[PDB]
Amino acid sequence: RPKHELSRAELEELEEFEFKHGPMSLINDAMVTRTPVIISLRNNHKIIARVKAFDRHCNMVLENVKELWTEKKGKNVINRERFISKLFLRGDSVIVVLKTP
Amino acid sequence: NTLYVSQLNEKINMQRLRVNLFLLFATFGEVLKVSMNFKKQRGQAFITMRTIDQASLAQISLNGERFFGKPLKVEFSKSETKTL
Amino acid sequence: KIQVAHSSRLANLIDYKLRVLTQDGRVYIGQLMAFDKHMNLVLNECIEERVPKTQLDKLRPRTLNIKVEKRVLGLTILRGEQILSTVVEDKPL
Amino acid sequence: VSTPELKKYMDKKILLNINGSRKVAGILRGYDIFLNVVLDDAMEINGEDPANNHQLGLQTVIRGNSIISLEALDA
Amino acid sequence: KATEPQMVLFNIYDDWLDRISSYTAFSRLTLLLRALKTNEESAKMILLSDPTITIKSYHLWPSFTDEQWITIESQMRDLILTEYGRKYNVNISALTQTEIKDIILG
Amino acid sequence: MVPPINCIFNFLQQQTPVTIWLFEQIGIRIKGKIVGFDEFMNVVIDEAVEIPVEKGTPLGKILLKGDNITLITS
Amino acid sequence: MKFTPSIVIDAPQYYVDHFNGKYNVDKCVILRDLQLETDSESMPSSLKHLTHILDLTNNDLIMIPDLSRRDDIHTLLLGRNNIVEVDGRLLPMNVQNLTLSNNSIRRFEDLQRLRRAPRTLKNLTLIGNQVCHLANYREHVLRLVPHLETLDFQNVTAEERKSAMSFPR
Amino acid sequence: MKLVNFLKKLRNEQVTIELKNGTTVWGTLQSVSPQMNAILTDVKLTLPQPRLNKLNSNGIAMASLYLTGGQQPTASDNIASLQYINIRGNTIRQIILPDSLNLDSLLV
Amino acid sequence: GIPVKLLNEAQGHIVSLELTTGATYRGKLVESEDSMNVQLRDVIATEPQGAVTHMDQIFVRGSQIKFIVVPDLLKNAPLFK
Amino acid sequence: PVNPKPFLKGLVNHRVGVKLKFNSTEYRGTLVSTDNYFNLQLNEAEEFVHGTLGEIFIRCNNVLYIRE
RNA sequence: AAUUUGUUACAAUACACAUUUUUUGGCACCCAAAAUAGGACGGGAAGAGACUUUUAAAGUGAGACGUCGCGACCCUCGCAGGAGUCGUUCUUGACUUUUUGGUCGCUUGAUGUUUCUCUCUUCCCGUUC
């Protein structure tokens, strides 16, 4: 059923369902259980972050997240690690997000 | 305010000519218009100034001054400019 | 140079000469007049400045003088999709 | 919301560039609000006009997202 | 998340007690117990500071090799050392072990 | 006039096989039997093979997203 | 009076010179008849505002010096200034024109101050200066100017530029 | 829920807005639009140096950086300092907010 | 918004276009919609690499447009009051 | 005459591969749930481009196609 | 013997929207170059090598779009964004007419894209230890 038919509260119940029961429930269960998540961006740089908050667009607030990025030129590789205490992440850059055991 | 020039070197380019004019007229006063709108060339250029006194001075001093070979014939404009 | 009001939004500033950055690395400098919801804006007398590839190499880290090829285009209407960031150049007449 | 106005273009042989590289020529049949354009007797233009040109199919539809410019070669 | 009165069992010690002797782990607990008050928000800043670290499902504490934990408890003490220190106005050099214990135990 | 998605519905019921070009970055073109479609022009293709740009491997019944669609060609 | 920051602030930077660029500044109450006897001090108050053109015409300035790094500035009008020497390293890459009419610049003093450049300016006017009268002054000015597009309204003649280059060699 | 409403309570804080270009902006933050258009005040915006035998940085971001008019000639590395940059929302990648503020109060 | 209304006010006048592909289409504007997709008449085209051609009619997608140059005398037009 | 959404409703808790548009990487795993946008959740996924991955969330814009 | 309060209308800001036409990304990659204890670095000029052209003698990696410019055996009269009309009263509105450069060389303007392949010596001027 299309979204333009529903009322103002039916959208709130719809978003509550989608967060509680749905794909993004992987992130929600990760926020409550304090389980660290791995996030791959489009950039190709992967952050190991603990999710304080998330949102519909997938943009999310992470604290203590660690960023891992490697670069190569003519098959000469170097691995670089960067630690930031507080992160707000816009959700359009992410591709895959996994929940660590 | 405006001063209608005449009898100048047509062989020189437009923008360059305008620049030259500006350079010339900065000593007398603040030049409001860089070059004449018509841009027919061959002398016809209206040097618009802020002050009338400055314009007058220019007219006095640069009457038959050597600018790109030929002597420039300075004179006061008939009608007032669109900017002024 | 010029100090913009500490809290000033795109609506607060009108007729200021701006400096507009697009995704392609070129800049449109001119007076802003209108703008829109998705932030496509209208510049009055605008000149697009560009960085030469040789100039771009010069910009790489080591007084630098860049030759910036620019062309004049009056009264344009930009597209919000292309715009990247905006800076203030001057204050109105 | 609003339908693009191709109304004078349809049934006329039209060239249109698909993406940065491509140029397809065909007789325009129909169109929609996203500019998705279906045309028949499609041909993919290339540097050598008779040689590298190869027809596509009896009916071809184009996503409006890949459309850049649309020129009609015709009245 | 509990709307009803009930008994629940959990382990405060988790990894550190399992790794390190029992006298010392309570002491590392008490270094922590003082600290989280002094860490209003930097707790989650310092405890998560190594993002490689994860909390075990049964356990409460971040499970780790315990070297940063010695660094964590030391940084946390310095936050306690300054906050106890600033209210009374003491120099950091003037702080001594007998004062540092008096900060810990009082 | 023949609306484009009407034409696609004529690809669904007429069971004609179609070749479909993807975006220029991916470098493969898919071909198969278009079964059904949505409003977003993302289509299910039965008995689809991916050809790099004729040794391509057969795919299956596969849902293909409309964002990457360029051409749908018989 | 002396060229201060306050004066600069006061100056009318509203009416832009529409020939090229923007913000045609005129320092003090009016740069035309400001009477700046000392060198152009407190240049930092402008802070490279904006072919940015500054009109200093009808002022007492002795030396063309004391500038802050100005990237924009392309035009200097310095007419009716008692300029003697104009040696500097600040305004080098910047600037496209220099109008020095009715000043006191020496034929040797003007040549000495520049020290020569591989490329410089593009438009130059030295008219109503003592130096221009001096014998071979045009040849000396062309040799000093090094690269040049104009010399007192008349362009250094292509052939004249070649002969001047030969004299330099 | 729109998490952008969080950023609107971060006003008057030191922040880095790390864009899609790789360009990073340190500055004091002002009102954030509902589209996440972020307007800053006193900002030093730069590009990181991939070392890697001096591999070539972003070619578009260097030009866009020199064309702000804020890059000073004598800067050895690649940076620019300016007042009042206004950033479109879709350009933002990451936002690094200060360590001091507590989330439990602001995330409600 | 005003920016699109100014494009509607430019109908029947020579305008310039920059597509995000890099080309330049200068010619007379016949139609424009609120989706910014315009169609132009008797238009000179400059390819991204500079090769210039001429075509009688053109229709471009608004999403691919980068900037549009409009006759200057529309600056004082009543939209800006 | 199956359409995409009932096709995803029929592929729930079946082994499905999903090819992303970038590196020709495909995640092979048991589908859990999908959103309106066709966001994906997977269990016991494996990344092919060789690894084993416990649980996965895949955003809708990056997927190329979905197969069984 | 202008201020404040109430009501009505219009305009601006914040309460919206991840599915091909603007703001929840077709994303990212060419690769490689300085270390010492008089010395580097940039710019200009000259010579030579190797390149090209003609049948030993001539200049500096080569081949393609434009961009505004240096010459001219040419054209060209010479003073009016504005102009006219009507309404209306001492300069305003509504309705019509429509830009100098029109060109050619460049006996190397001057200068940016895009493909392929592989510098040393001498002088002059600035910066750094």
From the list B33, E58, E33, the residue with the least C-alpha distance to G18 is B33
Q: Any idea what the Cα angle at residue G125 is, between residues G121 and G131, rounded to 5°?
A: 115
How many angstroms separate the CA of I50 from the C1' of K53?
31
How many angstroms separate the CA of I81 from the C1' of K76?
45
The three state secondary structure string of chain G is CCCCHHHHHHCCCCCCCCCCCCCCECCCCCCCCCCCCCCCCCHHHCCCCCCEEEECCCCCCCECCCCCCCCCEEEEECCCCCCCECCCCCCCCCCCEEECCCCCCCHHHHHHHHCCCCCCCCEEECCCCHHHHCCCHHHHHHHHCCCCCCECCECCCHHHHHHHHHCCC
SS3 B35: coil
SS3 H58: coil
Looking at the DSSP bridge assignments, the partners of residue F28 are: F52
Tally of residues, chain A: 101
- Indicate which of I19, I39, I66 best probes the interface with D, i.e. most D CBs within 10 Å of its own CB: I39
Tokens of J1: 């005459």
Contact H74, H24 (CB under 8 A): no
Give every CB contact of residue A17 below 8 A, 6+ residues apart in sequence.
none
- Is I13 within 7 A of strand K by CB distance? no
Q: Any idea what the Cα angle at residue E30 is, between residues E25 and E32, rounded to 5°?
A: 95
From the list F70, F61, F58, the residue with the least C-alpha distance to F26 is F70
Give every CB contact of residue I78 below 8 A, 6+ residues apart in sequence.
none
Rounded Cα distance, F59 and C53, in Å: 45
Q: How many whole angstroms from its chain centre is CA C84?
A: 10
Neighbours of E1 (CB within 10 A): 3
Query: Would you state the torsion angle of the CA atoms of residues A41, A44, A50, A56, taken in this order, to the nearest 10 degrees?
Result: 0
- Protein-contacted bases of chain K (C-beta within 7 A): 12-34, 43-46, 65-66, 68-72, 75-83, 99-101, 112-114, 125-127
Per-residue burial over H14-38, b if 16 or more Cβ lie within 10 Å, else e, is ebbbbbbbbbbbbbebbebbeebbb
**Residue H80 distance to chain A (closest CA, Å):** 23
**Domains located in chain F, CATH noted:** 1-74 (2.30.30.100)
**Domains located in chain B, CATH noted:** 1-84 (3.30.70.330)
From the list B6, B5, B9, B7, the residue with the least C-alpha distance to B69 is B9
- Is F23 within 7 A of strand K by CB distance? yes
Q: How many whole angstroms from its chain centre is CA J59?
A: 10
Interface contact flag, G57 B26, Cβ < 8 Å: yes
Give every CB contact of residue E7 below 8 A, 6+ residues apart in sequence.
none
Tokens of G118: 């591989």
Contact J53, A19 (CB under 8 A): no
- Residue C6's Cβ-side half-sphere holds a number of Cα atoms within 13 Å equal to 3
* Locus of tokens 């018989």: F74
Rounded Cα distance, G127 and G101, in Å: 5
* Locus of tokens 């589209």: H35
How many angstroms separate the CA of A73 from the C1' of K118?
23
Tokens of D56: 């596509």
Rounded Cα distance, B40 and B8, in Å: 12
Q: For residue E48, which amino acid is it?
A: L
Residue at shortest CA–C1' distance from K41:
C62
Q: If you write DSSP's letter for every residue of E46-88 in order, what string do you get?
A: HHSSSTT-EE-SS-SSEE--SHHHHHHHHHHHHHHHHHHHHHH
Give every CB contact of residue E98 below 8 A, 6+ residues apart in sequence.
none
Rounded Cα distance, J60 and J41, in Å: 11
Q: For residue J65, which residues of chain F lie inside 8 Å, CB to CB?
A: 30, 59, 62-65
Angstrom CA distances, E82 to E37, E70, H82, stand at: 13, 18, 37
Rounded Cα distance, I38 and B84, in Å: 40
Q: Measured between CB atoms, which of G26, G97, G154 is closest to B68?
A: G154
Which H/E stretch holds residue H63?
helix H59-66
Rounded Cα distance, J27 and J63, in Å: 10
Q: CATH number, domain at I55?
A: 2.30.30.100
Q: For residue D38, which residues of chain F lie inside 8 Å, CB to CB?
A: 2-4, 7
Contact A28, A35 (CB under 8 A): no
Which H/E stretch holds residue H16?
strand H14-19
From the list C16, C27, C1, C41, the residue with the least C-alpha distance to C93 is C16
Does the J1-68 domain belong in CATH 3.40.630.30? Answer: no
The long-range contacts involving G13-16, CB below 8 angstroms and separated by at least 24 positions, are G13/G49, G14/C93, G15/C93, G16/C93
Domain boundaries, chain J: 1-68
Rounded Cα distance, G127 and I44, in Å: 47
Tally of residues, chain H: 108
Q: For residue H69, which residues of chain G lie inside 8 Å, CB to CB?
A: 71
Looking at the DSSP bridge assignments, the partners of residue I29 are: I40
- Is H12 within 7 A of strand K by CB distance? no
Q: Which domain holds residue D50?
A: 1-75
Per-residue burial over G9-37, b if 16 or more Cβ lie within 10 Å, else e, is eebebeebbebbbbbbbbbbeebbebebe
Rounded Cα distance, F29 and F48, in Å: 10
Rounded Cα distance, I41 and I60, in Å: 12
* Locus of tokens 């203030």: C88
Rounded Cα distance, J49 and J53, in Å: 14
How many domains, chain G?
1
From the list G4, G89, G20, the residue with the least C-alpha distance to G54 is G20
Neighbours of F52 (CB within 10 A): 12
Rounded Cα distance, C31 and H94, in Å: 31
- Residue E35 phi, psi dihedral angles, 5° rounding: -75, -40
Contact B44, B5 (CB under 8 A): yes
Q: CATH number, domain at D64?
A: 2.30.30.100
Q: Any idea what the Cα angle at residue D31 is, between residues D25 and D36, rounded to 5°?
A: 75
- Is D3 within 7 A of strand K by CB distance? no
Interface contact flag, F4 D42, Cβ < 8 Å: no
How many domains, chain A?
1
- Residue H104 phi, psi dihedral angles, 5° rounding: -60, -30
Rounded Cα distance, B73 and H75, in Å: 52
Q: If you write DSSP's letter for every residue of A55-68 in order, what string do you get?
A: -TTS-EEEEEEEEE
Longest distance between any two alpha carbons in chain E, whole Å: 51
Dihedral sign (CA F2, F5, F10, F16): positive
Q: For residue J38, which residues of chain F lie inside 8 Å, CB to CB?
A: 65
Contact D45, D22 (CB under 8 A): no
Contact C84, H88 (CB under 8 A): yes
Q: For residue F25, which amino acid is it?
A: Q
- Residue J55's Cβ-side half-sphere holds a number of Cα atoms within 13 Å equal to 15
From the list G32, G18, G25, G20, the residue with the least C-alpha distance to G49 is G25
Rounded Cα distance, F33 and F54, in Å: 17
Contact G98, C68 (CB under 8 A): no
Tokens of C5: 């009001």
Contact A61, A52 (CB under 8 A): yes
How many angstroms separate the CA of A96 from the C1' of K25?
15
From the number of C-beta atoms within 10 Å of its C-beta (0-12, 13-18, 19+), residue A64 rates as buried
Which H/E stretch holds residue E7?
none
Per-residue burial over J9-42, b if 16 or more Cβ lie within 10 Å, else e, is eebeeeebbbbbbeeebbbbbebbbbbeebbbbb
Tokens of G25: 């500044």
Q: For residue H101, which amino acid is it?
A: L
Q: Which domain holds residue I35?
A: 1-81
The strand ranges marked E within I1-81 are 14-19, 24-32, 38-46, 52-60, 65-69
Residue of chain C whose Cα is closest to the Cα of H70? C87
- Is H93 within 7 A of strand K by CB distance? yes
- Is A59 within 7 A of strand K by CB distance? yes
Rounded Cα distance, J56 and J16, in Å: 13
- Strands J40-48 and J53-58 come out as antiparallel
Tokens of E28: 């590392």
Rounded Cα distance, G118 and A32, in Å: 69
- Is B16 within 7 A of strand K by CB distance? yes
List the determination method: cryo-EM
Tokens of C8: 């000033």
Q: CATH number, domain at A84?
A: 2.30.30.100
SS3 F17: strand
Angstrom CA distances, E104 to E25, E27, E79, E96, H84, stand at: 15, 10, 12, 12, 48
SS3 H38: strand
- Resolution reached, in Å? 3.2
